[PDB]
Amino acid sequence: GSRRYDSRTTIFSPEGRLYQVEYALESISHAGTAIGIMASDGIVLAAERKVTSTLLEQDTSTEKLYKLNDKIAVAVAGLTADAEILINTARIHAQNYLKTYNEDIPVEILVRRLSDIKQGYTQHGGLRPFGVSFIYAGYDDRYGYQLYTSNPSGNYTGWKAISVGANTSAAQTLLQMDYKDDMKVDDAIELALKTLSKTTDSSALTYDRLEFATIRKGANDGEVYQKIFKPQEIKDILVKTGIT
């Protein structure tokens, strides 16, 4: 019957590797680079828009930075379609936690759930895994600013600075070179743009090819603020940092 056409997406290799997870990663490696840098007073998310054009509308566009919560956001690397499916279930999960406990969902709790969903497509179902890798940037009163990462496998880890997508090896090296524990948000913001600027496959790192977001505790308040930069805001920050 059907057995003949079954790819068997959930099996071990003789080495004990998960073919599809490996291949999914292989796919991610060709996606626009996304970087997450965590500072003492905030977190930074930066991503390079893959495929752009004169005609591509950018004010309306979003393909790498999605707001999950009021204190959580993710940077995407891979299949946007696949990412949205997961993103929406994540937004729902956060709201449920809120309804059940009357408290905003702790960042890691949201990340473990999403990672679990992925992990599933790895052990049963005969379906393909999601070709997506997320960089999570969020804040809660138990661990303050946190930066996480999850991929097709369903595994996640915490980071001070991390990149996903293309040229991660290069990007990782450069971050490992200039990241310092005592960094400040604006410091991180610059390190971020610089790294991309150095790994970019393009000629110049123009604003029309970037998406930017920061989670800073607006001092004049006492609460945390999520901000996804608009085309012009990215264009500005791009000049100041010295990339014009």
Binding site: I11, G16, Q146, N155, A161
Partner: protein, 241 residues
């Protein structure tokens, strides 16, 4: 819907998916457990393929199932989560129905079953995980240490290790652990564990975490220093010769 028999027999009487599951374990970071005369200790190494993480939030390797029992593992991380959850759930359920927390053997038998079950059910692959479960039965001071594997097999050990280079550290333990006289001290027991890991961790006080379990839900994870210290007192032992 999907129910394809993924784990089946081959001519020589082998179940490759289960065996390949073990290969995933062999590739996992090392884990070890040694039981003293009044405590059990669990040690795990931390990979270094990438270093710039945030150890505060990155999930550690030794997990608490209940207040008197912990479980460590070697293999796929995503997989271990599903087992740890099921175990924690069963733990609370057992307390609720038997009005008594699980014995280490019971908890082990449970986890082992879940693993076995995933080796003869359609539509699923075995857990690329192998575990070490330890603690003290309710109102009992005799330390317990068990190990489970993808096949669903389990048994107790005086000391055991799983993961990469486990062959090595087992050797060290076989010619360094005397059942006749187990590490009578939490300190000397935690030392033997760090020693065994040093055979494979290749100097990494930041790549070695320890957890000491004592009778009556007394579970505590040591800090880099507490650990770093054992690393120190041990490296001298060598030089002094």
């Amino acid at each position: 819907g999907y129910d394809r028999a993924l784990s089946i027999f081959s001519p020589d009487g082998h179940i490759f998916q289960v065996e390949y599951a073990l290969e995933a374990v062999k590739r996992g970071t090392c884990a070890v457990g040694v039981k003293g005369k009044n405590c059990v200790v669990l040690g795990c190494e931390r990979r270094s393929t990438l270093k710039l993480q945030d150890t505060r939030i990155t999930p550690s390797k030794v997990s608490k199932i209940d207040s008197h029992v912990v479980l460590s593992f070697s293999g796929l991380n995503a997989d271990s989560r599903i087992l740890i959850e099921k175990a924690r759930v069963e733990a609370q359920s057992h307390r609720l129905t038997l009005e008594d927390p699980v014995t280490v053997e019971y908890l082990t038998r449970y986890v082992a079953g879940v693993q076995q079950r995933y080796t003869q059910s359609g539509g699923v692959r075995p857990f690329g995980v192998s575990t070490l479960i330890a603690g003290f039965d309710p109102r009992d001071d005799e330390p317990k240490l068990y190990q489970t594997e993808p096949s669903g097999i389990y048994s107790s050990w005086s000391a055991q290790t799983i993961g990469r280079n486990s062959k090595t550290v087992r050797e060290f333990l076989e010619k360094n652990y005397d059942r006749k006289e187990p590490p009578a001290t939490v300190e000397e027991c935690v030392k033997l564990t760090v020693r065994s890991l040093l055979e494979v961790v290749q100097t990494g006080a930041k790549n070695i975490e320890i957890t000491v379990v004592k009778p009556d839900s007394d579970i505590v994870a040591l800090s880099s220093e507490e650990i770093n210290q054992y690393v120190t007192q041990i490296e001298q032992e060598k030089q002094e010769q």
